[PDB]
Structure formats: C-alpha cells, structure tokens
Motif scaffolding. Structure first.
Motif, PDB file in Angstrom:
ATOM      1  N   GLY A  25      43.580  54.085  65.095  1.00 32.80           N
ATOM      2  CA  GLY A  25      43.940  53.204  63.996  1.00 32.80           C
ATOM      3  C   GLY A  25      45.355  53.234  63.486  1.00 32.80           C
ATOM      4  N   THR A  26      46.268  53.842  64.237  1.00 34.47           N
ATOM      5  CA  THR A  26      47.671  53.889  63.849  1.00 34.47           C
ATOM      6  C   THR A  26      48.549  54.204  65.042  1.00 34.47           C
ATOM      7  N   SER A  27      49.819  53.863  64.880  1.00 32.05           N
ATOM      8  CA  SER A  27      50.852  54.155  65.865  1.00 32.05           C
ATOM      9  C   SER A  27      51.598  55.423  65.473  1.00 32.05           C
ATOM     10  N   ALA A  28      51.405  55.890  64.237  1.00 29.00           N
ATOM     11  CA  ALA A  28      52.071  57.098  63.744  1.00 29.00           C
ATOM     12  C   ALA A  28      51.511  58.332  64.447  1.00 29.00           C
ATOM     13  N   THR A  29      52.355  59.323  64.684  1.00 28.65           N
ATOM     14  CA  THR A  29      51.959  60.491  65.463  1.00 28.65           C
ATOM     15  C   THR A  29      50.909  61.393  64.852  1.00 28.65           C
ATOM     16  N   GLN A  30      49.885  61.692  65.647  1.00 27.27           N
ATOM     17  CA  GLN A  30      48.838  62.635  65.277  1.00 27.27           C
ATOM     18  C   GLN A  30      48.631  63.599  66.415  1.00 27.27           C
ATOM     19  N   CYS A  31      48.530  64.882  66.074  1.00 24.51           N
ATOM     20  CA  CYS A  31      48.225  65.919  67.051  1.00 24.51           C
ATOM     21  C   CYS A  31      47.112  66.822  66.587  1.00 24.51           C
ATOM     22  N   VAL A  48      47.287  54.603  56.015  1.00 23.37           N
ATOM     23  CA  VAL A  48      46.807  53.231  56.098  1.00 23.37           C
ATOM     24  C   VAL A  48      45.983  52.911  54.859  1.00 23.37           C
ATOM     25  N   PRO A  49      45.839  51.640  54.516  1.00 26.33           N
ATOM     26  CA  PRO A  49      45.076  51.272  53.310  1.00 26.33           C
ATOM     27  C   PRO A  49      43.637  51.806  53.206  1.00 26.33           C
ATOM     28  N   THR A  50      43.259  52.355  52.051  1.00 21.03           N
ATOM     29  CA  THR A  50      41.910  52.900  51.895  1.00 21.03           C
ATOM     30  C   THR A  50      40.815  51.868  51.846  1.00 21.03           C
ATOM     31  N   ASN A  51      41.194  50.607  51.744  1.00 25.67           N
ATOM     32  CA  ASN A  51      40.199  49.562  51.761  1.00 25.67           C
ATOM     33  C   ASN A  51      40.001  49.025  53.150  1.00 25.67           C
ATOM     34  N   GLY A  52      40.627  49.676  54.132  1.00 26.78           N
ATOM     35  CA  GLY A  52      40.505  49.272  55.507  1.00 26.78           C
ATOM     36  C   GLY A  52      40.091  50.429  56.402  1.00 26.78           C
ATOM     37  N   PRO A  86      18.996  68.969  67.754  1.00 29.73           N
ATOM     38  CA  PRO A  86      19.653  69.873  66.815  1.00 29.73           C
ATOM     39  C   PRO A  86      21.151  69.874  66.991  1.00 29.73           C
ATOM     40  N   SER A  87      21.856  69.772  65.871  1.00 27.20           N
ATOM     41  CA  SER A  87      23.304  69.808  65.882  1.00 27.20           C
ATOM     42  C   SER A  87      23.812  70.592  64.678  1.00 27.20           C
ATOM     43  N   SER A  88      25.017  71.134  64.794  1.00 34.05           N
ATOM     44  CA  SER A  88      25.625  71.841  63.687  1.00 34.05           C
ATOM     45  C   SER A  88      27.127  71.638  63.706  1.00 34.05           C
ATOM     46  N   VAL A  89      27.729  71.798  62.542  1.00 26.08           N
ATOM     47  CA  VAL A  89      29.175  71.738  62.422  1.00 26.08           C
ATOM     48  C   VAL A  89      29.577  72.617  61.253  1.00 26.08           C
ATOM     49  N   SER A  90      30.776  73.174  61.334  1.00 19.96           N
ATOM     50  CA  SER A  90      31.371  73.938  60.242  1.00 19.96           C
ATOM     51  C   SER A  90      32.772  73.391  60.096  1.00 19.96           C
ATOM     52  N   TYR A  91      33.125  73.024  58.864  1.00 26.19           N
ATOM     53  CA  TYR A  91      34.391  72.389  58.540  1.00 26.19           C
ATOM     54  C   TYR A  91      35.264  73.219  57.600  1.00 26.19           C
ATOM     55  N   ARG A  92      36.573  73.060  57.745  1.00 25.01           N
ATOM     56  CA  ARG A  92      37.527  73.623  56.805  1.00 25.01           C
ATOM     57  C   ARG A  92      38.256  72.437  56.198  1.00 25.01           C
ATOM     58  N   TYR A  93      38.249  72.365  54.873  1.00 24.83           N
ATOM     59  CA  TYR A  93      38.865  71.265  54.165  1.00 24.83           C
ATOM     60  C   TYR A  93      40.192  71.635  53.525  1.00 24.83           C
ATOM     61  N   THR A  94      40.936  70.617  53.098  1.00 26.10           N
ATOM     62  CA  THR A  94      42.184  70.813  52.371  1.00 26.10           C
ATOM     63  C   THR A  94      42.075  70.049  51.052  1.00 26.10           C
ATOM     64  N   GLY A  95      42.803  70.516  50.049  1.00 20.78           N
ATOM     65  CA  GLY A  95      42.837  69.839  48.762  1.00 20.78           C
ATOM     66  C   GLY A  95      43.682  68.581  48.783  1.00 20.78           C
ATOM     67  N   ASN A  96      44.598  68.487  49.743  1.00 24.89           N
ATOM     68  CA  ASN A  96      45.479  67.334  49.875  1.00 24.89           C
ATOM     69  C   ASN A  96      44.995  66.370  50.940  1.00 24.89           C
ATOM     70  N   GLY A  97      45.515  65.158  50.892  1.00 28.40           N
ATOM     71  CA  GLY A  97      45.145  64.151  51.855  1.00 28.40           C
ATOM     72  C   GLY A  97      44.094  63.208  51.316  1.00 28.40           C
ATOM     73  N   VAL A  98      43.856  62.140  52.081  1.00 30.52           N
ATOM     74  CA  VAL A  98      42.812  61.164  51.772  1.00 30.52           C
ATOM     75  C   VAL A  98      42.028  61.043  53.070  1.00 30.52           C
ATOM     76  N   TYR A  99      40.769  61.469  53.044  1.00 29.97           N
ATOM     77  CA  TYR A  99      39.990  61.511  54.267  1.00 29.97           C
ATOM     78  C   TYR A  99      38.518  61.707  54.033  1.00 29.97           C
ATOM     79  N   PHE A 202      36.843  64.065  61.635  1.00 28.93           N
ATOM     80  CA  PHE A 202      37.404  63.577  60.384  1.00 28.93           C
ATOM     81  C   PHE A 202      37.967  62.190  60.545  1.00 28.93           C
ATOM     82  N   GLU A 203      37.966  61.429  59.455  1.00 34.32           N
ATOM     83  CA  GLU A 203      38.667  60.153  59.431  1.00 34.32           C
ATOM     84  C   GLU A 203      39.735  60.248  58.351  1.00 34.32           C
ATOM     85  N   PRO A 204      40.987  60.460  58.732  1.00 40.44           N
ATOM     86  CA  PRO A 204      42.077  60.475  57.757  1.00 40.44           C
ATOM     87  C   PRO A 204      42.696  59.104  57.482  1.00 40.44           C
ATOM     88  N   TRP A 205      42.951  58.849  56.197  1.00 36.43           N
ATOM     89  CA  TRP A 205      43.684  57.670  55.751  1.00 36.43           C
ATOM     90  C   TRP A 205      45.107  58.041  55.319  1.00 36.43           C
TER      91      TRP A 205
END
Length: 222
Positions: A25-31, A48-52, A86-99, A202-205
């Motif tokens: 969903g973007t041309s900006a660099t993600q790694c 990118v816009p949060t309404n999109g 059966p599936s499982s996931v463990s996540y680490r979150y951040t206080g910053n960002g929109v996602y 994750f889906e980051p905006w």
C-alpha cells in the motif's frame, strides 16, 4: 537475522511458515528483520490516510498466498473437512505509530492457491490510533471465549469480516475454525468452501518500527 526491504520479499521460519514484507500500500520504504521465530518491523517510512487502506501487511503465515505456500502446509482444505485449526501468535507493541495487529484468514469457494480470494477474515488483536476496519459494524460476537465487535463490508476486490478486540491482546492461542464458522454464519462462505491461508501481522498507517511478531504457529487438522 535476515533483513527484507523489497516490496514483496519473503523468506521462511522454522522451515514451516512464510514471512512476508508485503508492502502493498505504499512506495515508501519498509523493512523487516526476520529471526528464527518471528520478525520485527525495522523500517516503516511514510504514512497514508486512516480512512483508507494501510501501508502494508508484513506478516507470517501458513497456507498459500499468491502462489507462495508455506512448507508442508495442509491448506487449502475444505472447511467441512477441518477438525481443528489451532493457531497462536505473540506480539510486541509500541506506544507510537498508527496501526493494527491482526490475523488475515482467507476463504474461497475453490481450493485456491493464487489470486485474490473471495472472503477475508480479520481478527484485530490491537488498535493504536484512529484505525477502523473495512465496512461497518454489525454487532457483537463471542468467539473462542472472547468478545468481538464485528464489522462487514467490501474493500472493492473481496468481502471482509473483521473481529475487533475491546483492548490489546498481547498473545492468544485459539482455533481458527471458530472464526471460519462465523464467516459461514454471516453468509460469507459455506462449509464446502476452502480455507487457503492463516496469516498474522500488522497493518501500519503511520510509523510501525519496533513492532514485532515474537512467535506464531498454525496447524490445520483433518
């Protein structure tokens, strides 16, 4: 440790699951930096816009997604033949960002391994910032012993049913079949359709660096 920055770069972990940068969903660099058991978002430029749509969906998965299939997967499998998923996931979150942090689970009337699938099930484990799922809310559901706000709609290409948690879920182990059954009960599949992939990421905006999938598992038993 493998760094992946290419838009649609992938690799595997545990000789069992595919990890994908999936920067659709973007041309900006993600790694992402992929370790033996998960990955971390290490570059997530732009916004990118949060309404999109979001910038991307970096994720780990079982099954097949655009022809890229996880080693030894049993997907695609007819829904009615599934005993448990059966599936499982463990996540680490951040206080910053929109996602969001979410499962993306795909169903199709055919045993599809490539191309767009007809039905998308998203399970949102967390929301940071003013992010909202596709479509509109249609009520509350109890799945897997947890409560979810349910939304349904279309993204223009495929149908989507989303289950939103009321607060952050750091980790959960559950049966994906229970959510597949809810898709069926909402008229977005039948028992003769197929489960084609089970994905978590994750889906980051805006932002997104520091976010990680610590671990993931998926099995689909006949």
């Amino acid at each position: 440790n493998q760094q992946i920055c290419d838009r649609y770069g992938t690799t595997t972990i545990q000789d069992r699951y595919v990890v994908q940068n999936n920067r659709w969903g973007t041309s900006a660099t993600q790694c992402i930096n992929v370790t033996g058991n998960g990955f971390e978002i290490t570059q997530a430029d732009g916004s990118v816009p949060t309404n999109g749509a979001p910038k991307s969906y970096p994720s780990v998965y079982d099954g097949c997604h655009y022809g890229n299939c996880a080693p030894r997967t049993t997907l695609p499998m007819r829904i009615s033949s599934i005993g448990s998923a059966p599936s499982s996931v463990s996540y680490r979150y951040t206080g910053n960002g929109v996602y969001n942090a979410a499962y993306d689970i795909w169903l199709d009337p055919t045993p599809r391994t490539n191309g767009v699938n007809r039905t998308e099930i998203m399970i949102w484990f967390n929301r940071v910032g003013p992010v909202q799922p596709i479509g509109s809310p249609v009520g509350t559901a109890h799945v897997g012993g947890r409560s979810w706000e349910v939304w349904t709609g279309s993204n223009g290409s495929n149908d989507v049913i989303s289950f939103l948690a009321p607060s952050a879920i750091s980790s959960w182990s559950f049966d994906v079949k229970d959510f597949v059954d809810q898709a069926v009960s909402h008229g977005l599949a039948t028992p003769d359709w197929y489960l084609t992939s089970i994905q978590a990421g994750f889906e980051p905006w805006e932002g997104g660096t520091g976010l990680a999938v610590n671990s993931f598992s998926s099995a689909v038993n006949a």
